[PDB]
Amino acid sequence: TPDCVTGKVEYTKYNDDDTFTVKVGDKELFTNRWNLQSLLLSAQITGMTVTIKTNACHNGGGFSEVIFR
Amino acid sequence: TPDCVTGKVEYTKYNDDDTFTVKVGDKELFTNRWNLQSLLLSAQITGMTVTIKTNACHNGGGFSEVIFR
Amino acid sequence: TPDCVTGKVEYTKYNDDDTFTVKVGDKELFTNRWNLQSLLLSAQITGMTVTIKTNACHNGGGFSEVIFR
Amino acid sequence: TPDCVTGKVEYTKYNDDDTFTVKVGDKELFTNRWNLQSLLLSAQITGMTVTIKTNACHNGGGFSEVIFR
Amino acid sequence: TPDCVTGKVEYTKYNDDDTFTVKVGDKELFTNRWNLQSLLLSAQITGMTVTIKTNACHNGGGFSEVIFR
Ligand SMILES: OC[C@H]1O[C@H](O[C@@H]2[C@H](O)[C@@H](O)[C@H](O[C@H]3[C@H](O)[C@@H](O)[C@H](O)O[C@@H]3CO)O[C@@H]2CO)[C@H](O)[C@@H](O)[C@H]1O
Ligand SMILES: OC[C@H]1O[C@H](O[C@@H]2[C@H](O)[C@@H](O)[C@H](O[C@H]3[C@H](O)[C@@H](O)[C@H](O)O[C@@H]3CO)O[C@@H]2CO)[C@H](O)[C@@H](O)[C@H]1O
Ligand SMILES: OC[C@H]1O[C@H](O[C@@H]2[C@H](O)[C@@H](O)[C@H](O[C@H]3[C@H](O)[C@@H](O)[C@H](O)O[C@@H]3CO)O[C@@H]2CO)[C@H](O)[C@@H](O)[C@H]1O
Ligand SMILES: OC[C@H]1O[C@H](O[C@@H]2[C@H](O)[C@@H](O)[C@H](O[C@H]3[C@H](O)[C@@H](O)[C@H](O)O[C@@H]3CO)O[C@@H]2CO)[C@H](O)[C@@H](O)[C@H]1O
Ligand SMILES: OC[C@H]1O[C@H](O[C@@H]2[C@H](O)[C@@H](O)[C@H](O[C@H]3[C@H](O)[C@@H](O)[C@H](O)O[C@@H]3CO)O[C@@H]2CO)[C@H](O)[C@@H](O)[C@H]1O
Ligand SMILES: OC[C@H]1O[C@H](O[C@@H]2[C@H](O)[C@@H](O)[C@H](O[C@H]3[C@H](O)[C@@H](O)[C@H](O)O[C@@H]3CO)O[C@@H]2CO)[C@H](O)[C@@H](O)[C@H]1O
Ligand SMILES: OC[C@H]1O[C@H](O[C@@H]2[C@H](O)[C@@H](O)[C@H](O[C@H]3[C@H](O)[C@@H](O)[C@H](O)O[C@@H]3CO)O[C@@H]2CO)[C@H](O)[C@@H](O)[C@H]1O
Ligand SMILES: OC[C@H]1O[C@H](O[C@@H]2[C@H](O)[C@@H](O)[C@H](O[C@H]3[C@H](O)[C@@H](O)[C@H](O)O[C@@H]3CO)O[C@@H]2CO)[C@H](O)[C@@H](O)[C@H]1O
Ligand SMILES: OC[C@H]1O[C@H](O[C@@H]2[C@H](O)[C@@H](O)[C@H](O)O[C@@H]2CO)[C@H](O)[C@@H](O)[C@H]1O
Ligand SMILES: OC[C@H]1O[C@H](O[C@@H]2[C@H](O)[C@@H](O)[C@H](O)O[C@@H]2CO)[C@H](O)[C@@H](O)[C@H]1O
Ligand SMILES: OC[C@H]1O[C@H](O[C@@H]2[C@H](O)[C@@H](O)[C@H](O)O[C@@H]2CO)[C@H](O)[C@@H](O)[C@H]1O
Ligand SMILES: OC[C@H]1O[C@H](O[C@@H]2[C@H](O)[C@@H](O)[C@H](O)O[C@@H]2CO)[C@H](O)[C@@H](O)[C@H]1O
Ligand SMILES: OC[C@H]1O[C@H](O[C@@H]2[C@H](O)[C@@H](O)[C@H](O)O[C@@H]2CO)[C@H](O)[C@@H](O)[C@H]1O
Ligand SMILES: OC[C@H]1O[C@@H](O)[C@H](O)[C@@H](O)[C@H]1O
Ligand SMILES: OC[C@H]1O[C@@H](O)[C@H](O)[C@@H](O)[C@H]1O
Structure with a gap:
């Protein structure tokens, strides 16, 4: 799967449907x-x-x- | 969902029905x-x-x- | 529910039936x-x-x- | 249940059947x-x-x- | 089971099928x-x-x- 962003976690967010959002670099992504x-x-x-691949x-x-470094 | 309070957590409380209370700013809320x-x-x-949206x-x-900052 | 003890946790114990004991102040209690x-x-x-209410x-x-302060 | 060993944890080991081994003092025990x-x-x-009772x-x-002190 | 690598964890990786990869020494292994x-x-x-046996x-x-020391 290709690399998408690498950086420190700026903030995380717990979502109403129990998914979790993360902002790393310039992208906001959820898992x-x-x-x-x-x-x-x-x-x-x-x-x-962290490096997020997606x-x-x-x-x-x-x-x-x-990936956690 | 609108922002409601932003601040450091003042205390947390474990409740008798397994919900959890938090006091942030001037509001006491539960999840x-x-x-x-x-x-x-x-x-x-x-x-x-933390910022709580509700x-x-x-x-x-x-x-x-x-949101965790 | 009334306050019972407030203090720092002295020790905790894992029990044979999967309950957990805590000693705070002068009381030993379990959950x-x-x-x-x-x-x-x-x-x-x-x-x-911590303050335990019971x-x-x-x-x-x-x-x-x-309550955790 | 009688005390068996008290000391700091020397090492822990994750076992192939999901049990967990600990070495405290001069004994190696599992849970x-x-x-x-x-x-x-x-x-x-x-x-x-820690004090392990067994x-x-x-x-x-x-x-x-x-018991965790 | 024989020892395979001993060292500090260099990075860990969460995988798309919920397995977890670890790099210790010169080997990349998963559990x-x-x-x-x-x-x-x-x-x-x-x-x-950590010492990984496999x-x-x-x-x-x-x-x-x-083994964790
Ligand atoms: O956490 C949510 C979700 O994350 C991962 O999936 C991502 C997207 O949510 C998913 O829509 C996307 O699917 C792609 C396939 O990768 C691609 O092979 C196919 O051609 O198109 C679909 C639709 O766009 O994949 C990304 C990850 O690359 C994770 O895989 C998924 O199980 C789930 O956890
Ligand atoms: O703190 C949350 C929870 O603690 C106590 O429940 C424990 C587990 O969280 C709960 O999932 C578990 O359920 C057992 C059933 O008792 C058993 O009959 C079944 O076969 O398996 C499930 C899963 O292992 O029970 C333990 C406590 O024994 C507490 O009881 C519960 O009300 C709640 O506070
Ligand atoms: O906000 C602090 C508060 O959180 C917990 O209470 C929650 C709500 O605030 C409260 O409105 C709700 O009350 C329930 C009672 O539990 C129930 O016995 C009764 O029948 O219905 C009312 C609603 O009409 O309870 C929730 C918890 O689920 C916490 O319990 C409370 O002590 C306090 O910390
Ligand atoms: O953990 C409790 C609860 O948190 C979230 O719901 C919040 C309140 O508890 C809930 O009463 C409230 O309901 C709103 C609707 O969102 C809104 O669309 C409607 O117009 O008014 C009612 C009453 O004010 O919503 C807040 C969150 O905005 C969470 O959504 C819920 O699943 C549950 O976990
Ligand atoms: O973790 C064990 C237990 O903790 C909480 O209950 C406590 C005692 O275990 C319980 O016997 C006690 O019951 C009280 C009633 O609250 C009271 O209304 C009645 O008049 O007398 C009895 C005996 O004193 O309550 C305490 C907490 O106040 C928890 O509520 C329970 O679910 C369980 O987890
Ligand atoms: O010294 C601690 C020890 O913990 C782990 O082994 C445990 C017991 O010490 C060991 O006797 C036991 O062996 C059993 C197997 O579980 C069973 O499947 C087989 O059929 O019989 C033998 C002998 O009765 O296993 C437990 C773990 O469940 C650990 O394996 C060992 O390395 C060591 O740390
Ligand atoms: O984590 C493994 C196991 O730990 C606890 O049991 C321990 C031994 O595994 C068990 O064989 C041993 O049994 C004793 C009885 O306590 C005693 O009453 C009887 O007379 O002799 C047998 C054989 O020695 O007990 C220890 C703990 O004392 C735990 O109880 C068990 O559920 C399980 O977790
Ligand atoms: O998490 C993956 C897996 O880890 C453990 O198994 C490892 C390999 O996945 C497995 O292929 C390997 O199998 C060995 C046999 O143990 C050995 O007796 C035979 O001679 O050769 C095969 C192939 O090399 O074993 C390693 C660990 O030694 C774990 O046991 C398994 O349940 C699973 O968790
Ligand atoms: O956050 C996890 C879930 O919490 C609540 O459910 C809990 C617990 O996780 C669940 O296993 C149990 O059966 O019920 C508990 C609530 O009474 C929420 O109900 C879920 O939506 C999850 O968020
Ligand atoms: O931009 C990230 C957002 O993540 C979550 O939403 C995602 C996704 O963006 C949305 O289209 C989908 O319907 O739900 C996902 C979550 O289950 C958050 O809910 C948003 O607040 C954003 O953080
Ligand atoms: O400590 C939690 C329990 O551990 C053991 O069960 C685990 C696991 O928690 C359970 O959900 C799973 O189905 O089986 C596991 C291996 O047995 C004990 O058997 C329980 O008594 C709990 O102590
Ligand atoms: O962590 C020990 C177990 O891990 C794997 O099972 C996980 C999880 O623990 C379990 O609760 C869930 O239902 O399935 C998961 C696998 O997708 C192993 O497969 C188990 O054998 C245990 O080792
Ligand atoms: O990350 C592990 C799993 O997370 C999500 O499942 C959760 C929870 O773990 C599971 O017990 C429950 O049944 O559903 C939850 C989501 O609704 C993923 O959806 C799973 O596939 C696992 O990856
Ligand atoms: O006060 C709680 C008590 O709970 C019991 O189950 C245990 O045997 C005691 O040692 C003590 O921990
Ligand atoms: O070399 C170990 C490998 O294990 C796989 O399960 C994983 O998907 C790969 O990304 C890599 O980590």
């Missing part, structure tokens, strides 16, 4: 995998750099693949 | 989403600023949307 | 809510002050309401 | 309770002192009761 | 056990040394046994 919610908030809190690389796009 | 309980206690412990913006109102 | 186990060990590790305010009493 | 896995890794990472107090013995 | 995902990210964030000791190989 429906509940396992990723605490992993991404820990990355945010400790300042890790074909829907646009605002509002979904993802499931994340 | 029934179990996934938000450890995310909001981590935001409290590390001093993050139409029930009054004491005792419920919410499910939270 | 059967599994969601409270990691929230109380985080409060212990980061030194938060009518069974005696050693061995149960509880479910906790 | 089948999935709730204890992140509680024991947090105790190892932050250097807490009648199978020998290498390879199982336990479920742990 | 399908959901319980290991937050244990390995905590090991990565706090700089623990017979598939090659890039792309799977594992389930991890």
Whole structure:
């Protein structure tokens, strides 16, 4: 799956339908995998750099693949 | 959904029916989403600023949307 | 529900029937809510002050309401 | 249930059947309770002192009761 | 099961089928056990040394046994 954005997590958002939104770089993306919610908030809190891989690389796009550096 | 309060978490409370109460700004609100309980206690412990979005913006109102900054 | 003890968590214990015991102040109390186990060990590790509310305010009493400050 | 060992966690191990092994003091013991896995890794990472209570107090013995000081 | 790599976690990756990849030493390996995902990210964030035991000791190989010191 192609890389889409790499950067620190600027903010995260819990959504009304239990999906989770993340802003990394200049894109706002969401995931429906509940396992990723605490992993991404820990990355945010400790300042890790994440790379999100997705074909829907646009605002509002979904993802499931994340690399944590 | 409109913004209702933005601030640091002042305290959290675990309720008898397994919902979770939070006091942010001047409002005391609750959520029934179990996934938000450890995310909001981590935001409290590390001093993050949260924005709660809800139409029930009054004491005792419920919410499910939270932004973590 | 009335306040029973306020203080820092002295120790926590995992019990043979999957309940969790906590010692706050001068009372040792237990809860059967599994969601409270990691929230109380985080409060212990980061030194938060907790208030437990319960009518069974005696050693061995149960509880479910906790305020985290 | 009698005390068996008290000390800091030397290492933890994830086992092929999803049980979890811990070495505290001079004993290596395991638990089948999935709730204890992140509680024991947090105790190892932050250097807490744990007391394990079990009648199978020998290498390879199982336990479920742990006190976190 | 034989030791395969020992080292600090260099990166972790959440995969599209909910498995989790880890790079330790010179090998990139994956596990399908959901319980290991937050244990390995905590090991990565706090700089623990992990030993992965597996017979598939090659890039792309799977594992389930991890020692955390
Ligand atoms: O978290 C939501 C969602 O994330 C991942 O899917 C993403 C989009 O939501 C999904 O619509 C998109 O599907 C593409 C296929 O990748 C592509 O092969 C096909 O040609 O078109 C469809 C529709 O546009 O894929 C992205 C991820 O690349 C995740 O895969 C999905 O299971 C779900 O978790
Ligand atoms: O906001 C603080 C408040 O949160 C919790 O109460 C929630 C609502 O605020 C409250 O309106 C709601 O009341 C329920 C009662 O639980 C129920 O017994 C009764 O029959 O119906 C009313 C609504 O008409 O309760 C929710 C919780 O689900 C929290 O319980 C409360 O102590 C306080 O912290
Ligand atoms: O955790 C409780 C609850 O949070 C969210 O709902 C909030 C209030 O609890 C709910 O009463 C309120 O309902 C609104 C409708 O959204 C609005 O369309 C209608 O016009 O008025 C009612 C009453 O004010 O909505 C807020 C959130 O905006 C969450 O949606 C819900 O599932 C539940 O988790
Ligand atoms: O803290 C949330 C929750 O804690 C207690 O429930 C625990 C689990 O959260 C709950 O899913 C679990 O349910 C069991 C059934 O009791 C059992 O009959 C069935 O076979 O399996 C499910 C899943 O393992 O029960 C434990 C407590 O034993 C608490 O009871 C519950 O009300 C709520 O507070
Ligand atoms: O975690 C165990 C238990 O904690 C909470 O209940 C507590 C005691 O376990 C329970 O026996 C006690 O019951 C009270 C009633 O609240 C009171 O109205 C009646 O007059 O007397 C009995 C005995 O004193 O209540 C406390 C909490 O106040 C929790 O409510 C329960 O679900 C369970 O989790
Ligand atoms: O996590 C594994 C296991 O831990 C707890 O049980 C322990 C041993 O696994 C179990 O064999 C041992 O059984 C004892 C009885 O306690 C004792 O009453 C009887 O006389 O002898 C047997 C054999 O030694 O008990 C220990 C804990 O004392 C836990 O109870 C069990 O559910 C399971 O989690
Ligand atoms: O020294 C702790 C030990 O924990 C793990 O092994 C546990 C017991 O110590 C071990 O005796 C037990 O072995 C069982 C198998 O579970 C069972 O499937 C097989 O048929 O019989 C043997 C002997 O009764 O397994 C438990 C774990 O469930 C761990 O495997 C070991 O490396 C070591 O850490
Ligand atoms: O998470 C993936 C997987 O990890 C563990 O299995 C590993 C490989 O996935 C599996 O192919 C490999 O199988 C070995 C046999 O154990 C061995 O007896 C035989 O000689 O060779 C095959 C192929 O190399 O085993 C490794 C771990 O050693 C885990 O056991 C499995 O349940 C699953 O979690
Ligand atoms: O990330 C793990 C799973 O997350 C989502 O499922 C959640 C929850 O984990 C599951 O128990 C429940 O049945 O559905 C939830 C979403 O409605 C994904 O939808 C799953 O496919 C898993 O990836
Ligand atoms: O821009 C990111 C948004 O993510 C969530 O919405 C997505 C998606 O954008 C939307 O079209 C879809 O219907 O629902 C998804 C969530 O389930 C949030 O709900 C939005 O607030 C944005 O953060
Ligand atoms: O956040 C997870 C879900 O919370 C609420 O459900 C919880 C719990 O997760 C569920 O497994 C249980 O059966 O009921 C609980 C509520 O009584 C919400 O109802 C869900 O929408 C999820 O958000
Ligand atoms: O600690 C939680 C429970 O652990 C064991 O069960 C786990 C898991 O929690 C359960 O949902 C799954 O179906 O089986 C697992 C392996 O047995 C214990 O058997 C339970 O008593 C709980 O302690
Ligand atoms: O974490 C141990 C187990 O992980 C995998 O199962 C997960 C999850 O734990 C389970 O609750 C869910 O129903 O299915 C998931 C797999 O898609 C393993 O497959 C299990 O065998 C356990 O090892
Ligand atoms: O006060 C709560 C008590 O709960 C019991 O189940 C346990 O055996 C005691 O050791 C104590 O923890
Ligand atoms: O080399 C291990 C590989 O494991 C696969 O399951 C995963 O999809 C790949 O991205 C890679 O991590």
